[PDB]
């Protein structure tokens, strides 16, 4: 699922995906998204939102005796509408993209076996074995979170996109009237290589 919204002088976007091979992934994803939106609407950062989602899912899972057997992946970003700065965080294989200078560029790191094997100096691992998720909301101890180091200054018309691949061809976006919604999307998906046709998108344009 996805959401975008504005509150507390920020516009934010979130995507969550339940872990398919596990128990009650849909509920884990719902709890992650719910926690994240509450945090973001109240003025919190994407990293705050990830940590709150983890806390909510971890507690829920233990209380159900499912800890480690349920979870979700997510990506979240927020633009501060007062100063024009971007922050983001992600866990798992949902992705964050910067839209700047007319081009879409990858921000976030994947947590999966292939990425980990590369960082260990062992080379990539193609196929389902490499796609296995190594960090997710609901993991027993969450140590690996991909996140912005410092807020990134944006100019009007620039922004951020989060992606997870009936929601097919559904898009959620936060934008102002002055933002042309024909042109922005056109380019982003003119560059829309990064995701499939099957992808759920959420984006914020300053």
The residue among 16 and 145 lying less far from a second copy, judged by its C-beta, is 16
> What is the β-pairing status of strands 152-153 and 159-164?
unpaired
In the complex, the residues that contact a second copy under the rule CB under 8 A are 1-9, 11, 26, 29-30, 33-34, 37-38, 41-42, 81-82, 166-185, 189, 200, 204-205
The residue among 47 and 81 lying less far from a second copy, judged by its C-beta, is 81
Enter the tokens of residue 88: 């983001």
Least Cβ distance, residue 163 to a second copy (angstroms): 13
Radius of gyration of the chain (CA): 16
Least Cβ distance, residue 81 to a second copy (angstroms): 4
Enter the tokens of residue 71: 């979870």
**CA 159 – CA 96 distance, rounded (Å):** 11
The residue among 8 and 64 lying less far from a second copy, judged by its C-beta, is 8
DSSP H or E segment with residue 161: strand 159-164
Enter the tokens of residue 193: 């290589």
The one-character DSSP state at 23 is: T
**CA 25 – CA 44 distance, rounded (Å):** 25
Least Cβ distance, residue 172 to a second copy (angstroms): 5
The residue among 41 and 144 lying less far from a second copy, judged by its C-beta, is 41
Other C-beta atoms lying within 10 Å of the C-beta of residue 128: 8
> What is the β-pairing status of strands 146-147 and 103-106?
unpaired
Least Cβ distance, residue 39 to a second copy (angstroms): 9
The residue among 86 and 134 lying less far from a second copy, judged by its C-beta, is 86
Least Cβ distance, residue 145 to a second copy (angstroms): 22
């Amino acid at each position: 699922s996805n959401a975008v919204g504005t509150g507390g002088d920020k516009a934010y976007c979130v995507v969550v995906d339940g872990m398919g091979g596990m128990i009650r992934g849909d509920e884990a994803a719902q709890r992650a998204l719910s926690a994240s939106v509450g945090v973001l609407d109240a003025g919190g950062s994407p990293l705050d939102a990830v940590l709150a989602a983890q806390a909510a899912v971890h507690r829920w899972a233990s209380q159900g005796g499912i800890l480690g057997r349920t979870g979700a992946t997510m990506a979240v970003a927020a633009v501060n509408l007062r100063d024009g700065t971007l922050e983001w965080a992600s866990v798992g294989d949902c992705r964050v993209y910067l839209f700047k200078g007319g081009r879409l560029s990858r921000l976030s790191l994947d947590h999966n076996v292939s990425s980990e094997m590369v960082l260990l100096g062992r080379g990539p691992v193609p196929g389902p074995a490499g796609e296995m998720i190594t960090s997710f909301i609901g993991i027993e101890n969450l140590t690996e979170i991909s996140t912005s180091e410092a807020p990134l200054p944006l100019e009007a018309g620039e922004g951020v996109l989060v992606v997870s691949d009936l929601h097919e061809d559904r898009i959620a976006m936060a934008l102002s009237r002055g933002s042309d919604a024909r042109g922005i999307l056109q380019e982003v998906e003119a560059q829309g290589r990064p995701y499939q046709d099957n992808a759920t998108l959420a984006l914020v344009i300053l």
